[PDB]
């Protein structure tokens, strides 16, 4: 009887591994979208900068 | 293939997978120590220089 049983574990094993596999891509996409955010936070940050020309000091009186 | 043999193996492949997983976090925190360590050594050596202040000065007999 060892072939109909077989088939039966043999489902589970299948099922929970496409289950397993269907979160680890989904865990994939969510970890190399925020790689690639951190790269482009990070340029912005040292580009932005600012220069000073010029030093008045007046009097309203 | 009855679900009977089929759970001790399941067991075996657990129990050493746990018992690896076990051995990398430990040796993971060493080697973070370490490096650790180094730059703090590196630091200290570059800042602990000494100048000469003054003349030098022979007393004859």
Avoid at 12 to 35: C, H, K, P, Q, Y
């Amino acid at each position: 009887i060892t072939a109909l049983e077989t088939a039966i574990i043999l489902i589970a094993f299948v099922v929970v591994a496409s289950v397993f596999a269907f979160t680890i891509l989904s865990a994939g996409t969510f970890s190399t979208e925020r790689g690639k955010e951190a790269v482009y936070a990070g340029l912005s940050e040292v580009r932005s900068s600012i220069e000073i020309k010029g030093s008045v000091v007046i009097i309203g009186e």
